[PDB]
Amino acid sequence: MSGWESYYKTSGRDSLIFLVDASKAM
Amino acid sequence: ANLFSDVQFKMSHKRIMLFTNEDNPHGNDSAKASRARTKAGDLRDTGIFLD
Amino acid sequence: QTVASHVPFADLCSTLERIQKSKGRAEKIRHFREFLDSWRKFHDALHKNHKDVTDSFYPAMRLILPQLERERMAYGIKETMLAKLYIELLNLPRDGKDALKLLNYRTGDFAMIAYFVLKPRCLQKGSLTIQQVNDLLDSIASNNSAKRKDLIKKSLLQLITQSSALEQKWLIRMIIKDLKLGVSQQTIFSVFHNDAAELHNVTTDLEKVCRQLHDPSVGLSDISITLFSAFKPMLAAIADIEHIEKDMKHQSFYIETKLDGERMQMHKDGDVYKYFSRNGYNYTDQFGASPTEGSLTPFIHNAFKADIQICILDGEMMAYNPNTQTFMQKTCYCVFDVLMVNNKKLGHETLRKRYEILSSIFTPIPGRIEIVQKTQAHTKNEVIDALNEAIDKREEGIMVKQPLSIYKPDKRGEGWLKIKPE
Numbered sequence: 421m422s423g424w425e426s427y428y429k430t431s432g433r434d435s436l437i438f439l440v441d442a443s444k445a446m
Numbered sequence: 447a448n449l450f451s452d453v454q455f456k457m458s459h460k461r462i463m464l465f466t467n468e469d470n471p472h473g474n475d476s477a478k479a480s481r482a483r484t485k486a487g488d489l490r491d492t493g494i495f496l497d
Numbered sequence: 498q499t500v501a502s503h504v505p506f507a508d509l510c511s512t513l514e515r516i517q518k519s520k521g522r523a524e525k526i527r528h529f530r531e532f533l534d535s536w537r538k539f540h541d542a543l544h545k546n547h548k549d550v551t552d553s554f555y556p557a558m559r560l561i562l563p564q565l566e567r568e569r570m571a572y573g574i575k576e577t578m579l580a581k582l583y584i585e586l587l588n589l590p591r592d593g594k595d596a597l598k599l600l601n602y603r604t605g606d607f608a609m610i611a612y613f614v615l616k617p618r619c620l621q622k623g624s625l626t627i628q629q630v631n632d633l634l635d636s637i638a639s640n641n642s643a644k645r646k647d648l649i650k651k652s653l654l655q656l657i658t659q660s661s662a663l664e665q666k667w668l669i670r671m672i673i674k675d676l677k678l679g680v681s682q683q684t685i686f687s688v689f690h691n692d693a694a695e696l697h698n699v700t701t702d703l704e705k706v707c708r709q710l711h712d713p714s715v716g717l718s719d720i721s722i723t724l725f726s727a728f729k730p731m732l733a734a735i736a737d738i739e740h741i742e743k744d745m746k747h748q749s750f751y752i753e754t755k756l757d758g759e760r761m762q763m764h765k766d767g768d769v770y771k772y773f774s775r776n777g778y779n780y781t782d783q784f785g786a787s788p789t790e791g792s793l794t795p796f797i798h799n800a801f802k803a804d805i806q807i808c809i810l811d812g813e814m815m816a817y818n819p820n821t822q823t824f825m826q827k828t829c830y831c832v833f834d835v836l837m838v839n840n841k842k843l844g845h846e847t848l849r850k851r852y853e854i855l856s857s858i859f860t861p862i863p864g865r866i867e868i869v870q871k872t873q874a875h876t877k878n879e880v881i882d883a884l885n886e887a888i889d890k891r892e893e894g895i896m897v898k899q900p901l902s903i904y905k906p907d908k909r910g911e912g913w914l915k916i917k918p919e
Binding site: 447448451477480481484485488489491492 | 589
């Protein structure tokens with residue numbers, strides 16, 4: 421008989437981005 | 447709340463009194479406490495006083 | 498002792514949730530197959546002693562595919578009515594956030610909003626089985642058709658109080674009949690059985706699709722052919738010789754001489770001989786029903802071997818003149834196919850097995866019954882030679898058969914090919 425519980429048994433390429441500041445000091 | 451809703455007459459006041467001596471009705475389970483808090487808040491919004 | 502009475506609704510809801518969550522079709526198919534296999538194993542275990550069982554996968558299949566529900570009438574509760582009922586029953590404030598979210602859902606579907614609302618307001622483990630849910634939905638539909646809303650409210654309240662948040666979401670989706678899982682009807686039917694979609698198309702009643710096609714091994718062919726029953730024999734499709742080699746992936750085939758005789762089927766069972774035509778017309782009186790009556794039946798009783806007791810055959814009936822040993826075009830019979838022998842059914846087996854077992858049915862005897870002449874060919878030159886020989890013999894044309902073809906009654910195409918001059 422048992423029950424329902426028993427039967428259920430529940431590479432690539434590198435990328436680089438440059439970021440240059442554009443302020444007065446530079 | 448269901449008992450309050452059944453009444454057909456106009457009810458100026460809605461009131462509930464809790465006669466109990468257990469300050470921690472649900473200490474083992476926190477979900478039950480959260481559900482009770484939510485239900486109490488909903489009842490307060492409905493306009494049911496709790497004592 | 499239906500299986501649906503032992504299966505909690507929570508398990509079905511969890512399986513559906515897992516299917517929806519998964520992205521790839523493979524995971525969804527695996528989950529559905531595992532659930533169905535568990536159900537089938539439990540069904541086999543439960544019904545070991547019973548002989549006739551009407552239990553099937555219908556209780557769960559109807560819920561999984563609400564758009565195919567026809568036994569249940571319209572529930573009469575759309576999104577707005579469901580929201581109003583939820584607001585009234587849960588006793589939420591009319592002006593509260595939950596009520597505004599439920600009512601104003603931009604008539605993110607309503608099911609998700611209801612699930613979010615009920616998540617902190619409902620239990621975590623339900624206790625309603627599939628049978629109970631089906632009964633409640635049946636009651637709701639019957640009461641809607643009877644114009645009664647109090648009992649509808651009672652049933653909805655029972656469902657709300659005896660269900661969790663996920664179960665409520667799935668029930669709302671089922672009522673709205675918008676159960677989306679990422680797998681269409683065709684995929685679910687294919688997972689269930691290999692011949693479910695076409696059967697459901699043939700008959701728009703889901704119960705029989707789930708009942709008859711219960712055992713995966715038993716194909717549509719076995720159920721389509723029954724003892725003392727008149728089925729619909731298939732027919733070949735006209736094709737050109739120039740592309741004949743392309744009809745069978747350049748594989749070996751069988752060439753048969755077409756006979757200008759009416760298609761007819763018969764069943765032999767002891768001293769009982771049943772006869773039927775392609776259209777189902779009964780003509781057992783023409784040749785009798787017993788070996789002691791009729792013209793053709795008496796001469797074929799001894800033809801069958803002792804090893805054969807129950808059999809079903811189909812072929813062509815024509816007229817034969819022994820004096821000139823000729824066949825006259827529009828009693829002799831030709832046998833070229835066997836549908837069932839003994840308890841076992843030959844429908845599932847390919848044409849090769851049928852041809853192999855034909856020789857063991859009865860000893861051919863010219864004049865009354867024999868086996869239609871046929872050969873094996875794999876080249877266009879052989880087809881041309883066979884066609885020329887048939888034309889020289891006044892035969893209408895040629896039958897081309899693929900050994901790998903299976904018996905598919907009531908279908909056009911497959912290995913049945915008709916070749917005629919044109």
